[PDB]
Design an enzyme around this catalytic site. Structure first.
Site, short mmCIF file in Angstrom:
data_model
loop_
_atom_site.label_atom_id
_atom_site.label_comp_id
_atom_site.label_asym_id
_atom_site.label_seq_id
_atom_site.Cartn_x
_atom_site.Cartn_y
_atom_site.Cartn_z
N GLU A 42 1.54 11.22 0.63
CA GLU A 42 0.81 12.44 0.99
C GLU A 42 1.65 13.67 0.61
O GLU A 42 2.49 14.12 1.39
CB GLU A 42 0.47 12.43 2.47
N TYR A 74 -11.53 11.83 6.05
CA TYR A 74 -11.44 12.36 7.40
C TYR A 74 -10.35 13.42 7.42
O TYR A 74 -9.70 13.70 6.40
CB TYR A 74 -11.16 11.25 8.42
N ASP A 92 1.09 5.13 0.58
CA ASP A 92 0.48 6.27 1.24
C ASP A 92 1.36 7.50 1.02
O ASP A 92 2.01 8.01 1.94
CB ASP A 92 0.28 5.99 2.71
N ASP A 148 0.84 -1.19 0.00
CA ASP A 148 0.00 0.00 0.00
C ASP A 148 0.88 1.24 0.00
O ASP A 148 1.79 1.36 0.83
CB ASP A 148 -0.95 0.02 1.19
#
Ligand SMILES: [Ca+2]
Length: 569
Positions: A294, A370, A292, A290
């Site tokens: 950002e 979120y 991630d 995965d």
């Protein structure tokens, strides 16, 4: 027949072997600490004293021949390669012209990183986590965080595995530029620099080997001689117990994303991808990767980086190359590997990638629905809302209006549905999106009633600063709070408000809050009802399922709500 062979346990390492040598009493570069071998070097000694030892030896595992060689005297040391982990009933056979003598079976242990040699983990799960008629075709994901075994004191055996299909292990660093790691404070940047000594830039490493594979966990039966310990040995045992459960490494995240911005250089991607393949070959309990990052285009922890022009294509290219690498791993092992990624869902994040081009390579997008609002500033808001709350000004949901200082809005407002729709409009198939649920609150202090422009809606007020609290209440950083901490310190047993806090629910946004009229403390979070709304929404849209950040903060309620809101039609 020859004399019966007799196994010298001391001279046979007490019949314990391992495909992976792991530094247990130091912290060093990744390759000073981790050495993997496709073939375990097995060494068995045996004795046939003042007798007839015979001409040749055979070694069987569970009655199957794995080794053979000549016998010469009463002391025979047998060495040979074995490449498959497990426990085995080993027998030593000595032969000569007149027949064959045998030792009594003894259990040989060949440790490997798939857990093939381990008994299913012994769980210690809070029983508030309820039993569910699991549907294995729906995604129920969550994040487990490597550092949560310290102060938060939440270990792999506390995970409600039976209610999960997908475990994201946070986080795996990338060697290279990582100035972001410093704002985390503490020892974190130093730990990285230690693990990356002797490691080429853009290779993955383990950030905290103490937590990963060093710490002796009693409930896991670890001891001094134990060849793999820590979180990883526990995840390995967890796979034996729950074989269909996907356990996937999560690379990057908020502070470990800096190196992704150099993946515009294909040669850095080549080095990264290759290190990811060796990682998965080395740590066989993982089921994919995965990413991630950002974020492509910027906006993350490094105010310093972000290329809205070239990052998007770098990410698409990375997914293709990661897919092609995992394909050839699937060919080498017969396994299936998954490729996923957690992304921002604000419109300004989403527009920086053509997810239609990259999704073709991916299994799931974990939509980070979120952190829409929080304590970095003093604007109250629903941090994890399905839809736009009433506190939003006209034309603010869709970005058609102007803000309360007369300035215009540049894109739609931060909600999950604004995010999803923008992805559906892009061409992302609905059955690859996973909706995110929060298991924590974000909160402010000093939103006193008299700051409200709408007296029914503290989301309409103004804050004085971040929420404050103690570790014991679940406040690990100012303005952030575990859901279990909200539950027992603001909601109470009946969920009707305690210690000065009220409960409220924006039915239009599908977002709860708790609000202390006196202190002006305001918390936005995900609760049982709001997660139910997300289940319904997911089903209604053909979304693959739900996922949560972060499991240690749940008390049972949120994962429960996740299963229940997903049940039925
Ligand atoms: Ca952007």
């Amino acid at each position: 027949a020859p004399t019966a062979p007799s196994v010298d346990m001391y001279g046979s390492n007490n019949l314990q072997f391992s495909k992976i040598e792991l530094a247990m009493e130091t912290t060093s570069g990744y390759y000073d600490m981790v050495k993997y071998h496709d073939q375990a070097k097995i060494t068995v000694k045996f004795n046939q004293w003042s007798g007839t030892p015979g001409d040749t030896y055979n070694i069987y595992f569970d009655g199957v021949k794995v080794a053979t060689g000549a016998i010469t005297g009463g002391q025979t040391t047998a060495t040979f390669d074995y490449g498959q982990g497990g426990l085995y009933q080993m027998e030593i056979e000595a032969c000569d012209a007149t027949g064959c003598s045998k030792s009594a079976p003894a259990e040989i242990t060949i440790a490997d990183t798939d857990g093939s040699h381990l008994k299913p983990l012994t769980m210690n799960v809070d029983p508030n986590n309820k039993t569910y008629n699991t549907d294995p075709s729906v995604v129920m994901g969550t994040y487990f965080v490597e550092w949560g075994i310290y102060g938060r004191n939440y270990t792999v055996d506390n995970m409600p595995a039976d209610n999960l299909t997908h475990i994201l292990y946070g986080f795996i660093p990338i060697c290279g530029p990582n100035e972001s790691v410093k704002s985390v404070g503490g020892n974190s940047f130093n730990a990285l620099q230690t693990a990356c000594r002797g490691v080429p830039d853009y290779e993955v490493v383990i950030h905290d080997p103490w937590a990963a594979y060093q710490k002796s966990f009693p409930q896991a039966g670890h001891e001094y001689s134990t060849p793999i310990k820590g979180n990883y040995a526990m995840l390995m045992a967890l796979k034996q117990r729950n074989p269909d459960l996907k356990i996937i490494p999560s690379i990057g995240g908020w502070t470990l994303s800096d190196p992704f911005y150099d993946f515009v250089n294909k040669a850095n991607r080549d080095t990264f991808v290759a290190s990811v393949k060796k990682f998965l070959k080395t740590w066989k309990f993982y089921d994919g990767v995965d990413i991630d990052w950002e974020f492509p285009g910027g906006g993350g922890a490094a105010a310093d980086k972000g290329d809205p022009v070239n990052d998007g294509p770098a990410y698409v290219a990375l997914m293709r190359e990661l897919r092609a690498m995992l394909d050839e791993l699937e060919a080498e092992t017969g396994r299936t590997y998954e490729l996923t990624s957690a992304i921002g869902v604000g419109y300004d994040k989403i527009e920086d990638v053509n997810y239609a081009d990259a999704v073709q390579y991916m299994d799931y997008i974990f939509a980070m629905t979120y952190d829409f609002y929080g304590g970095w500033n003093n604007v109250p808001g629903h941090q994890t809302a399905l839809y736009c709350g009433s506190f939003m000004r006209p034309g603010q949901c869709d970005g058609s209006g102007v803000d309360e200082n007369g300035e215009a809005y540049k894109g739609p407002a931060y909600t999950a549905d604004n995010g999803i729709q923008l992805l559906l409009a892009q061409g992302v198939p609905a059955n690859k999106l996973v909706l995110g649920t929060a298991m924590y609150g974000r909160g402010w202090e000093g939103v006193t009633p008299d700051t409200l422009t709408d007296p029914n809606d503290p989301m309409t007020g103004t804050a004085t600063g971040k929420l404050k609290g103690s570790t014991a209440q679940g406040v690990w950083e100012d303005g952030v709070i575990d859901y279990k901490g909200i539950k027992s310190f603001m909601l109470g047993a009946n969920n009707t408000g305690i210690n000065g806090f009220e409960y409220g629910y924006d039915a239009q946004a599908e977002a709860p809050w708790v609000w202390n009229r006196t202190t002006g403390e305001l918390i936005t979070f995900d609760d049982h009802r709001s997660v139910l709304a997300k289940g319904s929404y997911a089903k209604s849209l053909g979304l693959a399922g739900l996922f949560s950040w972060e499991i240690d903060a749940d008390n049972g309620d949120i994962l429960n709500a996740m299963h229940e809101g997903m049940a039925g039609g």
